[PDB]
Write a protein that binds this ligand. Structure first.
Ligand code: CLA
Ligand code: CLA
Ligand code: CLA
Ligand code: CLA
Ligand code: CLA
Ligand code: CLA
Ligand code: CLA
Ligand code: CLA
Ligand SMILES: CC1=CCCC(C)(C)[C@H]1/C=C/C(C)=C/C=C/C(C)=C/C=C/C=C(C)/C=C/C=C(C)/C=C/C1=C(C)CCCC1(C)C
Ligand SMILES: CC1=C(C/C=C(\C)CCC[C@H](C)CCC[C@H](C)CCCC(C)C)C(=O)c2ccccc2C1=O
Ligand code: SF4
Ligand code: SF4
Ligand code: SF4
Lengths: 742, 60, 139, 147, 74, 161, 80
């Protein structure tokens, strides 16, 4: 029983004393401010626990309680989304008429004329149109009334109180010891089996006993208040049998392994529900049940307290061949003693999963009536692409912090890390070459096309009409997925997604999904994507691999993760740290995700979204101009940015005038950021000297001596305002455009 | 000057030029800069003490 | 005094961070030191190497790489028996550090002061007086 | 609208002058680098000590004021050109009404007058304004490369 | 008319920046404080902090209120 | 009137501004039933719009060709409520804030740790200072003439040149 | 090469010599200060211009001053 619970009782006293002493957590800051830099230095390093404390136990305790605090904030946020849906929304009107009422769960107060933002969203309601897709989530859950939304808001509030209590309790009353946190096998067993498997299983039970009957009654056309309450499905099996007759047999088919009895509600239909334009909820129920079994089985892999199971260290140490030295030896010790190494992995995975979520949710729209709510589809794609890109760059930020701080060569002799660092010149030179080749042969095709179109030579272009770059591999994969139902997935009835090919799905005379054809423009923008992803990897990988030392600075690890430079010598070593590669790689992340969301926005408006009409023909939002105009830069400038900025710039005096104002405000903030990015600290310190003189003249100089921001903070302020302004401008443009036309 | 006295700095390249410091000690050797002066403001380097010559320091 | 070229080197598996063509055609630097143990250190050019018990010898491209390793060994393993040499492609070896047997931060007799200016930094000459004149700005 | 743009021009003139004057008067010395005259006009910095000294030279104040000069002549020529093209149509009231807020400058000057320029070539052909249409994109490229 | 106005205003802005740049080069390189004791030039350097602080004030006074009136109208 | 402008009460374009602004609200009100909350809200807006235009018409503002009220700021007394009187109100509040902050900075200099008083403010003493600002012109001018506002040039640190 | 100067305000704290990554500076005897020693710069051909010496110095304006000059293979820090 070496996996055991071990707790220190009453470690830290619940006192307001250290609240009154800002900077108490570090020896430098606790002696008080003398310059304004102290103030910035206070906020910058506060959650950097391993810079204040030496011991891994106290660091682990602070992290566990901070995770409860984050959970409390998320639960309060969810409770507020449910409360605003219950109290300030037109959810009931939306349930009666989804394809006509526009969701709105935010109402403004009348103060300075701002009540113009309460536009006519429909259903006898005035408010701000919301695009988070909560209404479709609630309808998929089977909510059907505001009263149940009040109970969900209360459940969120109770959970939020329980998490903030638990964070206090587990830091101040009962803090686990380090040997409790250093149980990776136990934690994985419980998080796979218990967190994921039970979670999937419990959700599958809700879908089978609540979501599936309520939604079958809704899609038959029954009014929401005419639908029986969800517990009458739980007790009276006769009504559930009337909807799905397999329930007449109960749990005998489950236990005797006669599982094909349950095919009424555990289907493998594929495709979309024609009524709602969403995934079949019988498919999602079978999906969650299948995942639950796999996750619970996965949870029995690792050894905890009874001899069955794997040792994770033995698995890692056995995988070594003739190219890779000692192999994965020493990685277990890293990943159970370094929090930063774990955060680097988990941030890269969370970001990757968020980008996958973004792709899978527009192509296989899971919620009822979310496919034809085009503002929601554009919003949730753009949001999860930005979360993915940010989390992916934070994985490289904390890989750099690991290398600078937690990496020790004595325990990493001739293993995989040692070998990567010992051929990092070959890695970065080959990646650098790939980024040059791929920028020439992706963006230079655009420059070739602009020049030929400008010269009158349209036969010399890379286009469908002229020289053709055909995405043959992607077209072939689309063919395979269209041929799959009945062939390589024989029990499937429809394709996984209509994007691959097949029918046009229309809901409320709007296209839910239809095949997304690929041509020369799709080949070109996909290689644009491959190029922007490659260089972002190069900037972040070069920062992680050269974080400790280079040919330039042989002792970079002694300066730390975040230092501004090592002086003007050696020609100049400005921005040589690992932090400065995270700083430079967030710009290239911004560039990559901006072209991805622009590609999505133009391609869906041009070729997928639109209104079905007589004869079955479809009129798209921008009328199929992507194919012949996404091949030049002038086409993107004119037919995408200029043509679609009409709604944001003409929005004044309407309910979308808020987007019109945020468009300008973010354009302003973006420009304001370049003051911090193009300038240097020394100018601003000398300007502050003359302003200090004028304060000295009037005897009003402060005792906290004003300083220009540090070199690193100047870079961080410039990057933060750059990201805010660029993303905010895209946010305002995307939302005003798709609310007006979609 | 004397220890514990208040002085106005007259070194034009000092951070504390024309400000008041306090005399810490005065060397008696053949030192070029024998007067030790402490200040309440820190310089750009975060130092709050410096050596000065008598000519560089004036009593207030 | 002179570099005994036959001294065994620390065990190392090789890396791409080592020296290039300019080392065999312009100059290379060498560092030697005595170790009481057979222990792992970090190379200035890359990953980890293992120093052999007794006397070790390395070749690096920059003098700063030799001094970065020397500071690392002194703090980590308390080794101060390090000698840094400059070696030219003619075969001539130039002893570099510590230059007169004593470390620079410890005073020694017979050291002559180079670069010392008799006044404080604000007593320099303005650029205009020394314009079209060879006279130096340091007074 | 002419009142508001004249005050913006005055702000730009004062700010460009501030950087250039501060650069000239702090050229010989400051509190960060009191011996700045021994190093010349154009030097990179004095290193990361004393808090950091990036852009401390008088040349760097020329560098910083060049952006403000470009901004100033931008506001002046945008004003001249919008007021004159609206008078040349006979539609001076379009400038009179739209110049008092910034969205009028964004949609009624930049966006409205962009359309003949960005249609100099398109998938339907080209005309003699194609060369300016290319130079326009060329200008957007070099500017961004400067970043 | 548009090209000629734009051309000569851009030339003007470049010439005006260059005048101040070469005044800075004058102070660094050619200015001798001992041949200019208590001149107009030396007294400029004697109250440079006042000129820079006042220029900082007028720029903020113009900037806060011009941007404020424009944003108000918007 | 002044500078070829028209008083807003008789300019016809101000009247068209009011009429177009009310038709814009009435066409939104035409989609709702009488006692509903959107109908009540829009009627409140129509009344507020009419009140604003009526008040501006009788205030002595001068509309332009556009029909939007213009402000005269050359100093004439018939238009002092548009810049001169709001300006006097501003300078009183701004001088109050400046005088009160200066008084607290001088108090905080005489403290045990002067920099702790500025990130952790002594609220009773700072409220004592915020109350004193109502007679800042007299207090600040007496401060000036008694040689306590302006410090002499040789107690101020300056750059070498 | 870069030119490194030591002015007579040096208090002999030896901080510049310990901070120098390229062994440019050393301590020599001098009766001017209380510590009895002053920094010296005999090996400025090896100076890379990092200015770590200037960061280490505690006198009000730096006793050690580095003046970046002509660039060489040594002062550029080039291992190629
Ligand atoms: C967590 C997310 C969240 C968000 C973003 C919002 C956002 C909003 N809510 Mg909702 N709300 C939420 C959760 C949320 N709510 C929850 C959980 C509940 C259930 C209790 C409600 C119940 C609710 C009601 C009943 C109403 C709103 C309303 C509003 C709107 C105006 C709020 C306002 O101005 O009041 C401002 C109110 C104040 C008292 C101002 C307080 C400002 C202080 C100074 C903030 C200071 C924080 C403090 C200093 C932190 C440090 C602590 C200290 C010890 C130092 C706004 C759109 C209003 C609305 O929609 O009207 C149409 C409304 O009437 N909310
Ligand atoms: C079945 C057991 C189980 C479950 C469900 C969890 C669940 C969780 N752990 Mg883990 N953990 C476990 C065992 C378990 N742990 C063991 C044995 C160890 C020791 C090795 C740890 C050590 C550990 C650490 C060190 C950390 C976690 C964290 C977390 C949270 C991850 C963030 C997240 O997704 O939360 C959001 C998702 C939710 C579903 C929120 C649910 C909240 C409650 C707690 C879930 C369980 C409630 C209860 C069982 C359900 C009753 C159902 C009933 C109505 C029928 C999550 C609540 C992290 C964290 O955030 O700490 C707070 C963290 O830092 N765990
Ligand atoms: C954690 C998830 C969860 C939870 C709490 C429940 C809870 C319940 N299920 Mg459900 N169920 C689930 C998952 C879940 N189920 C899954 C994943 C499946 C798919 C295999 C089913 C399929 C299912 C069927 C087919 C039936 C239930 C029934 C029931 C009830 C049990 C009554 C009983 O023992 O007699 C069962 C009957 C016998 C003859 C024995 C109870 C309300 C039964 C019920 O009362 O229907 C409303 C019922 O007939 N469940
Ligand atoms: C699960 C996620 C997670 C976690 C736990 C951490 C945790 C940590 N990170 Mg990592 N990081 C993450 C995600 C995460 N980060 C991501 C996604 C990125 C990519 C951008 C990074 C990039 C990164 C870098 C580059 C650095 C860290 C550092 C740190 C540490 C110090 C935190 C601190 O004191 O900040 C205090 C928090 C603040 C000062 C908050 C201000 C940040 C922005 C500007 C405010 C947010 C703006 C807001 C959302 C929008 C405003 C609205 C506007 C319209 C007004 C801590 C270990 C630092 C370190 O040195 O650690 C050793 C460090 O240098 N991280
Ligand atoms: C429009 C602006 C712009 C442009 C063109 C570039 C261009 C480049 N950047 Mg830079 N960058 C920019 C903005 C820009 N950046 C900004 C704003 C930042 C701020 C954070 C950075 C930060 C940054 C970093 C940190 C990195 C780059 C890298 C790169 C290179 C990518 C490799 C490549 O595509 O080579 C191909 C070149 C191009 C696509 C440029 C256009 C050339 C086209 C095809 C036309 C060629 C015309 C031809 C030569 C004419 C010949 C005749 C003529 C001479 C007369 C390339 C040199 C990366 C790098 O060097 O890795 C390789 C890298 O690590 N950049
Ligand atoms: C849109 C872009 C932009 C803006 C607004 C500014 C603004 C300014 N610059 Mg910068 N600058 C920029 C771009 C920009 N610059 C670029 C690209 C460069 C080239 C590198 C420079 C280079 C530069 C130099 C070299 C100098 C300036 C100076 C100035 C000031 C001159 C105007 C003035 O004095 O009052 C205008 C004041 C403002 C515009 C401030 C706005 C008021 C704010 C937004 C209040 C809002 C508070 C709000 C509630 C906060 C919300 C926070 C949220 C988290 C809640 C001002 C701070 C000069 C200076 O500092 O003069 C003293 C100066 O020396 N700038
Ligand atoms: C650009 C320079 C400028 C300046 C500095 C002023 C300044 C002034 N003008 Mg204006 N004015 C100007 C140009 C200018 N004007 C132009 C170009 C015209 C168009 C011809 C006018 C037309 C004008 C009129 C028609 C009037 C003024 C008045 C005034 C005075 C009223 C302010 C006050 O309260 O003082 C006086 C009050 C006190 C000292 C104490 C009050 C408590 C003030 C001195 C008014 C005035 O009284 O004239 C002297 C007045 O009736 N001005
Ligand atoms: C109450 C304190 C106070 C006082 C009396 C002054 C007084 C002055 N300032 Mg300073 N200033 C202050 C705070 C103060 N400042 C703060 C907090 C900042 C940081 C934002 C600055 C930044 C600053 C700059 C950058 C400039 C001045 C300038 C000036 C002068 C002209 C007026 C002006 O331009 O206002 C401008 C005011 C600001 C830019 C910021 C004021 C912010 C608030 C409104 C005031 C501070 C409130 C404070 C918290 C009071 C608390 C009181 C309480 C404890 C009882 C004048 C000498 C200018 C100058 O040198 O002209 C010759 C100039 O260029 N100030
Ligand atoms: C940086 C620097 C350091 C030192 C050296 C340095 C190079 C010298 C210096 C550079 C300094 C620089 C670059 C200085 C630049 C200085 C400039 C641009 C000065 C502009 C002067 C314009 C004047 C006086 C216009 C007067 C018009 C009038 C009076 C019109 C009057 C009127 C008439 C007759 C007709 C209309 C009615 C009214 C209005 C009555
Ligand atoms: C303007 C500028 C400054 C000066 C900026 C300063 C001193 C910031 C001071 C602004 C006030 C004092 C606080 C700002 C508060 C704002 C109202 C917004 C607050 C945002 C949150 C932090 C609260 C630098 O120090 C600098 C350094 C390096 C490169 C570029 C620059 C640079 O561009
Ligand atoms: S410029 Fe700023 S960053 Fe680059 S070296 Fe000089 S100081 Fe370090
Ligand atoms: S600049 Fe660098 S190399 Fe040169 S003396 Fe100073 S610390 Fe040594
Ligand atoms: S130059 Fe500065 S750091 Fe070096 S010994 Fe002298 S006082 Fe110390």
């Amino acid at each position: 029983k070496k996996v055991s619970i071990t707790v220190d009782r009453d470690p830290v006293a619940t006192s307001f004393e250290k609240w009154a002493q800002p900077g108490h957590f570090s020896r430098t800051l606790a002696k008080g401010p003398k310059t304004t830099t102290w103030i910035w230095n206070l906020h910058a390093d506060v959650h950097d626990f391993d810079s204040h404390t030496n011991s891994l136990e106290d660091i682990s305790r602070k992290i566990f309680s901070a995770h409860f605090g984050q959970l409390s904030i998320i639960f309060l946020w969810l409770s507020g989304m449910y409360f605003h849906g219950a109290r300030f929304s037109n959810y009931s009107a939306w349930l009666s008429n989804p394809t006509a009422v526009k969701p709105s769960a935010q109402v403004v107060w009348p103060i300075v004329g701002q009540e113009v933002l309460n536009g006519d969203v429909g259903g006898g309601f005035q408010g701000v149109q919301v695009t988070s897709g909560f209404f479709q989530i609630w309808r998929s859950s089977g909510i059907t009334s505001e009263v149940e939304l009040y109970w969900c808001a209360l459940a969120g509030l109770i959970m939020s109180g329980l998490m903030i209590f638990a964070g206090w309790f587990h830091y101040h009353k009962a803090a686990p010891k380090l040997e409790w946190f250093q149980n990776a096998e136990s934690m994985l067993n419980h998080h796979l089996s218990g967190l994921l498997g039970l979670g999937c299983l419990s959700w599958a039970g809700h879908q089978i006993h609540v979501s599936l009957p309520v939604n079958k009654l809704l899609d038959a056309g029954v009014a929401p208040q005419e639908i029986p309450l969800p517990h009458e499905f739980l007790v009276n099996r006769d009504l559930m049998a009337q909807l799905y007759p397999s329930f007449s047999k109960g749990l005998v088919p489950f236990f005797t392994l006669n599982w094909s009895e349950y095919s009424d509600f555990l289907t493998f239909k594929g495709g979309l529900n024609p009524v709602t334009g969403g995934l079949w909820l019988s498919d999602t129920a079978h999906h969650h049940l299948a995942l639950a079994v796999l996750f619970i089985v996965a949870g029995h892999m690792y050894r905890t307290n009874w001899g069955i199971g794997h040792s994770m260290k033995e698995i890692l140490e056995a995988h070594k061949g003739p190219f890779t030295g000692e192999g994965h030896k020493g990685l277990y010790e890293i990943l159970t003693t370094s929090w930063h190494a774990q955060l680097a992995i988990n941030l890269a995975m969370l970001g990757s999963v968020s980008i996958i979520v973004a792709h899978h949710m527009y192509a296989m729209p899971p919620y009822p009536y979310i496919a034809t709510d085009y503002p929601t589809q554009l919003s949730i794609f753009t949001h999860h692409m930005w979360i993915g890109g940010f989390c992916v760059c934070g994985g490289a930020a904390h890989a750099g912090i690991f290398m600078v701080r937690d990496y020790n060569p004595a325990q990493n002799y001739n293993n995989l890390l040692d070998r990567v660092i010992r051929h990092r010149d070959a890695i970065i030179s080959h990646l650098n070459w790939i980024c040059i080749f791929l920028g020439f042969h992706s963006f230079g095709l655009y420059i070739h096309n602009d020049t030929m179109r400008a010269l009158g030579r349209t036969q010399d272009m890379f286009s469908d009409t002229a020289i053709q770059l055909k995405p043959v591999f992607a077209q072939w994969v689309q063919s395979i997925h269209t041929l799959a139902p009945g062939n390589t997935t024989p029990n499937a009835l429809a394709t996984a997604s209509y994007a691959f090919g097949g029918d046009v799905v229309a809901v409320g005379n709007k296209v839910a999904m239809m095949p997304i054809s690929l041509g020369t423009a799709d080949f070109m923008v996909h290689h644009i994507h491959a190029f922007t992803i490659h260089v972002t990897v190069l900037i972040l990988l070069k920062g992680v691999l050269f974080s400790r030392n280079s040919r330039l600075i042989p002792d970079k690890a002694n300066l730390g993760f975040r230092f501004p430079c090592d002086g003007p010598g050696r020609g100049g070593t400005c921005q040589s740290s690992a932090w400065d590669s995270v700083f430079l790689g967030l710009f290239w992340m911004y560039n990559c995700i901006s072209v991805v969301i622009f590609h999505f926005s133009w391609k869906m408006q041009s070729d997928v979204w639109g209104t079905v009409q007589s004869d079955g023909t479809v009129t798209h939002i921008t009328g199929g101009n992507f194919a012949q105009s996404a091949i030049t830069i002038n086409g993107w400038l004119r037919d995408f940015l200029w043509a679609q900025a009409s709604q944001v710039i003409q929005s004044y005096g309407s309910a979308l005038s808020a987007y019109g104002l945020i468009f300008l405000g973010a354009h302003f903030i973006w420009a304001f950021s370049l003051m911090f990015l193009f300038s240097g600290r020394g100018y601003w310190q000398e300007l502050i000297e003359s302003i200090v003189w004028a304060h000295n003249k009037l005897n009003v100089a402060p005792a906290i001596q004003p300083r220009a921001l540090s070199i690193t903070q100047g870079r961080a302020v410039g990057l933060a305002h750059y990201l805010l302004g660029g993303i905010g401008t895209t946010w305002a443009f995307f939302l005003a455009r798709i609310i007006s036309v979609g | 000057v004397k220890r514990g006295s208040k002085v106005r700095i007259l070194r034009k390249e000092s951070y504390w030029y024309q400000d008041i410091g306090t005399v810490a000690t005065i060397d008696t050797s053949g030192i070029r800069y024998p007067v030790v002066v402490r200040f309440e403001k820190v310089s750009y380097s975060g130092v709050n003490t410096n050596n000065f010559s008598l000519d560089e320091v004036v009593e207030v | 005094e002179t570099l005994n070229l036959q001294i065994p080197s620390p065990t190392f598996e090789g890396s791409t961070g080592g020296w290039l063509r300019a080392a065999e055609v312009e100059e290379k630097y060498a560092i030697t030191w005595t170790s009481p143990k057979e222990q792992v250190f970090e190379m200035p050019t890359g990953g980890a190497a293992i120093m052999r018990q007794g006397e070790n010898l390395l070749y690096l491209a920059r003098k700063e790489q030799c001094l970065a390793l020397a500071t690392q060994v002194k703090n980590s393993f308390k080794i101060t028996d390090y000698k840094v040499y400059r070696i030219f492609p003619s075969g001539e070896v130039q002893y570099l550090h510590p230059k007169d047997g004593v470390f620079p931060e410890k005073v020694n007799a017979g050291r002559v002061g180079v670069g010392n200016v008799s006044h404080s930094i604000g007593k320099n000459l303005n650029p205009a007086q020394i314009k079209f004149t060879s006279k130096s700005f340091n007074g | 609208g002419d009142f508001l743009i004249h005050h913006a021009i005055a702000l730009a003139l004062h700010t460009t002058t501030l950087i250039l004057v501060k650069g000239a008067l702090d050229a010989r010395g400051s509190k960060l680098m009191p011996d700045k005259k021994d190093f010349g006009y154009a030097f990179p910095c004095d290193g990361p000590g004393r808090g950091g000294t990036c852009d401390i030279s008088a040349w760097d104040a020329f560098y910083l004021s060049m952006f403000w000069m470009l901004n100033t002549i931008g506001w002046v020529t945008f004003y001249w050109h919008w007021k004159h093209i609206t008078i040349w149509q006979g539609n001076a009231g379009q400038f009179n009404e739209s110049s008092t807020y910034i969205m009028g400058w964004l949609r009624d000057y930049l966006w409205l007058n962009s359309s003949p320029l960005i249609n100099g070539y398109n998938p339907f052909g080209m005309n003699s304004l194609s060369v300016w249409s290319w130079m326009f994109l060329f200008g957007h490229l070099i500017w961004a490369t400067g970043f | 008319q548009s090209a000629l106005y734009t051309h000569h205003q851009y030339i003007a802005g470049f010439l005006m920046v260059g005048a101040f740049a070469h005044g800075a080069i004058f102070f660094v390189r050619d200015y001798d404080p001992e041949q200019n004791k208590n001149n107009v030039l030396a007294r400029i350097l004697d109250h440079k902090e006042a000129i820079i602080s006042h220029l900082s004030w007028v720029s903020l006074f113009l900037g806060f209120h011009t941007l404020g009136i424009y944003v108000h109208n918007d | 009137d002044v500078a070829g402008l028209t008083p807003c009460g008789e300019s016809k374009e101000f009247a068209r501004r009011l009429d177009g602004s009310v038709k814009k609200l009435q066409t939104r009100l035409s989609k709702y039933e009488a006692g509903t909350p959107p109908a009540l809200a829009l009627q409140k807006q129509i009344d507020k719009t009419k009140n604003r235009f009526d008040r501006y018409g009788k205030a002595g503002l001068l509309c332009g060709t556009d029909g939007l009220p213009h402000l005269i700021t050359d100093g004439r007394w018939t238009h002092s409520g548009e810049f001169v009187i709001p300006g006097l109100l501003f300078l009183y509040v701004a001088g109050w804030i400046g005088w009160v902050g200066r008084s607290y900075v001088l108090f905080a200099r005489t403290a045990d740790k002067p920099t702790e008083k500025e990130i952790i403010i002594d609220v009773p003493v700072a409220l004592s200072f915020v109350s004193t600002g109502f007679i800042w012109p007299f207090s600040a001018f007496k401060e000036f003439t008694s040689g306590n506002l302006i410090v002499p040039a040789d107690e101020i640190t300056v750059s070498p040149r | 090469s870069h030119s490194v100067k030591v002015y007579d305000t040096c208090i002999g704290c030896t901080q510049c010599v310990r901070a120098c990554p390229c062994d440019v500076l050393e301590m020599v005897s001098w009766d001017g200060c209380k510590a009895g020693q002053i920094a010296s710069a005999p090996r400025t051909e090896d100076c890379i211009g990092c200015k770590r010496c200037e960061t280490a110095c505690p006198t009000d304006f730096l006793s050690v001053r580095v003046y970046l000059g002509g660039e060489t293979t040594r002062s550029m820090g080039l291992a190629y």
